[PDB]
C-alpha cells in the first residue's frame, strides 16, 4: 500500500493513489498503460516507511509494500541504503534510504499485467501491486 498523496503517472497525466478507481489506467513497468483490476478501501493506522530513491523520488508506503530489486523482492522495511537497486524487465534507481515515519492513510491496487508492477512517484519508480 502507498500513501494516498502518492502521485502516479497515467497515460494522460498524473493521479494520486487516493483518486484511483477500478478500471483506471496506470503505467506498467514497461511504461505502457495497465488497467486497475482492484483497489482497496483507505486503510488507516498502518506502519509506514519513507523510501527515498537516487532520482529524488520519495514515496511513503506501508512496511510490507513490495519493491522489485536486483537481488529480490524486498518490503519497504527491508530496503537497504546503497545495497539495493530497483530493476525491471535494466537498472532504474538506487535506494538511498528507507526509514520508519508516522502512519498516514494508504491504499493498495491490483493491476492487470502479469508482473504485478506499476510506476509510482514523480520519478515513475516501478513498484509491486497486491
Ligand atoms: Cl525474491
Residue numbers in the entry: 1 to 89, 106 to 146
What does the literature reporting this entry say, word for word?
All splicing domains found among inteins have the same structural architecture named HINT (Hedgehog/INTein) which relates to the C-terminal domain of the Hedgehog protein (Hh–C or hog domain).
We determined the high-resolution crystal structures of two variants of the class 3 MchDnaB1 intein (MchDnaB1_HN and MchDnaB1_HAA). As observed for other class 3 inteins, a mutation of the last Asn145 residue to Ala in the MchDnaB1 intein (MchDnaB1_HAA) largely halted the reaction at the branched acyl-intein intermediate. The WCT motif found in the class 3 intein participates in forming the catalytic triad, in which Cys124, His65, and Thr143 could serve as nucleophilic, basic, and acidic functional groups, respectively. Importantly, we could observe clear electron density near the side-chains of Cys124, His65, and the backbone of Val125 for both crystal structures of the MchDnaDB1_HN and MchDnaB1_HAA inteins (modeled as oxyanion waters in Figure 2a and Supplemental Figure S2). However, the crystal structures of both MchDnaB1 intein variants (HN and HAA at the C-terminus) lacked electron densities for the N-extein sequences. In the MchDnaB1_HAA intein bearing an extein residue, the distance between the Cβ atom of the +1 residue (Ala) and Sγ atom of Cys124 is 4.7–5.0 Å. However, this distance with the +1 residue of the C-extein would be much shorter (<3.0 Å) when the χ1 angle of Cys124 was in the trans conformation.
